[PDB]
From a paper:
The HIV Tat protein bound to a host super elongation complex (SEC) recognizes TAR and releases the paused polymerase. HIV Tat binds simultaneously to TAR and positive elongation factor b (P-TEFb), composed of CDK9 and Cyclin T1 (CycT1) subunits. In turn, P-TEFb and the transcriptional elongation factors ELL2 and ENL/AF9 associate with hydrophobic segments in the approximately 1200-amino-acid AFF1 or AFF4 scaffold, together forming the SEC. P-TEFb triggers promoter escape by phosphorylating two negative elongation factors (DSIF and NELF), as well as the C-terminal domain (CTD) of Pol II.
Numbering used by the authors:
A (entry chain B): 7 to 261
B (entry chain D): 1 to 49
C (entry chain A): 8 to 88, 97 to 330
D (entry chain C): 4 to 21, 33 to 69
The structure:
Amino acid sequence: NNNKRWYFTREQLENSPSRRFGVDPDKELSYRQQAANLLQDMGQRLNVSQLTINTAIVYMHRFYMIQSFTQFPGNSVAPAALFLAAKVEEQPKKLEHVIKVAHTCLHPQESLPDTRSEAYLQQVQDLVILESIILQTLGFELTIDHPHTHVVKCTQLVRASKDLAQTSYFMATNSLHLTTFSLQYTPPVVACVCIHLACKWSNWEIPVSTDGKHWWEYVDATVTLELLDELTHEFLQILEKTPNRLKRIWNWRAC
Amino acid sequence: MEPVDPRLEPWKHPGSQPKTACTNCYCKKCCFHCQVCFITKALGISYGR
Amino acid sequence: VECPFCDEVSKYEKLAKIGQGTFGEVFKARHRKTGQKVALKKVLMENEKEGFPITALREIKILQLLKHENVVNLIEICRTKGSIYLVFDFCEHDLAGLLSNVLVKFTLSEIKRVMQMLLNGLYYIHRNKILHRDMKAANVLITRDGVLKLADFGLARAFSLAKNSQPNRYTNRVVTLWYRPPELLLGERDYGPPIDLWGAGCIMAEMWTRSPIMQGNTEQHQLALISQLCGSITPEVWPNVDNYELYEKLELVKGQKRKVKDRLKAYVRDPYALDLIDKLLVLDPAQRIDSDDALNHDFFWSDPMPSDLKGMLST
Amino acid sequence: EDRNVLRMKERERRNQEIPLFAEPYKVTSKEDKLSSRIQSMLGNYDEMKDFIGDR
Ligand SMILES: Nc1ncnc2c1ncn2[C@@H]1O[C@H](CO)[C@@H](O)[C@H]1O
Ligand SMILES: [Zn+2]
Ligand SMILES: [Zn+2]
């Protein structure tokens, strides 16, 4: 039962280290989403793989099943996690570069601190420390499996169109950003939920195989239609609770 | 946003940086410019104040 | 500051220093309550320039994956109330030490067994898409019961069979210089398992010479020593070696004939042994023997058959 | 007992340590509650599909 270490029940998620310090469920979930968004932004500026960002996000999710947002702000943890993930996923970025990108994101007003300043070397010390804390908190379990792997593999099998492949993959990223599925269900299960959701939206339908089995049976042997509907439900529920509550805020105008 | 063949080795994966810089326009195209834009513009999630 | 999945290293008692690793100091220690021996490899975060070393991260990742009788075993990772310690299963001996020890004498049978276990280990890690990238006598451990263990994966990494297309650009300056193969010295960055087997050849020669066979001081010096011993590096013996940007930029001696068997003849004596070393120190990695072919070589299945080390080690 | 056999037995010990679907189609009806919900919330898929991903 070493798997169930980084997988939790709803009772455990409800009793988070942050709940322990008086942080509302919706507010903690918000803090996670912001960290994910910050990780994604920084990652895109650093130009690392999405894999790196995704790994960094799972670290963050797991970090806060042990530590509290009270004690460790997301905006301090996030650059450390990404810096670590960058190495693990074989696209390492210079520590100088990360602190730069992090500064740009969190302080667009301030000027980029001097590389010699006492204040800059303090930023370095904090990042390197947090990395060490993240590593120890995770028990040096740094190998992460993502839904994207199984999503892409599955869409090839079922001969999906580019849009359906794109959308399924897109929902996989959204699952990491907006939910705590990475802490509840294994990547193959989440992959199905994403594909299932993309299908219900697009009205694409995946038939049964030549051997009479549903597509998700080729992804995970524990998944059932009952589970998929129920999780797609929960996924949508999380989507509504986002700010802008899904309303279409664009303008139908030029630029 | 864009799928990546998982069979690629980690050091082979393309970078996540979009070809074009993120704007402040809120048109449909710009709200789905990239993952960051979608999460921040379309869904209203931000880490900054 | 909670930390449930990282025990304190206090549970172990350091007994002595036992060498310098890829990124740390290494200590022999015994568990305070059970007496179980371990090797603590301390991650030296002196280099806070890039935080936790990616070099150490790879070792931890890789050894959590690899599990084999001839690969060293990672037990856990410990902290101090801070510095990090990698905790390995302890091995009484290392091959370099044994070869330097004058009281240690190998029978031919025992050498066969050492090389057999070594190549078995290399065979395993290679099929799991891992390069060791630091094959040398000092990184080969042997337990009290005479079981060989490949160790110090600080320099190891995963590699690809990619993809009839865009080739890899791995790190070039790897492997201890003395055991570094020709292609790396010529700047190859799309290499593979053969680089480890070059080292296996170098180590196999040491089993009889009791001293590293090519001790260069620079990459050019090492290349020169290789040329003298293995013959001149030429397209005739190594197709498309021309294509290396540095092939002419370095100026390589052209006269040298191959003298591998000639020079090792007096020390090794065994015919099959000489042949296997000859196939391991082939210049062109495409023509260099591989783990599987090596392990089926007559050297391992002719008399005297390999025997257990346990005997020789107690002296 | 022979070397060839003892050799092969070891070669193997070494070694032992190491269209299903039709093309998906559109479905106008019947509609289920899940789909109906999703479409009401995310909107019309075809209006969005060319914005999610690359062209
Ligand atoms: N378990 C061990 N037993 C003996 N020496 C070791 C052990 N681990 C590492 N070393 C030594 O550490 C150095 C390389 O890390 C070599 O000198 C090697 O012999
Ligand atoms: Zn616009
Ligand atoms: Zn953008």
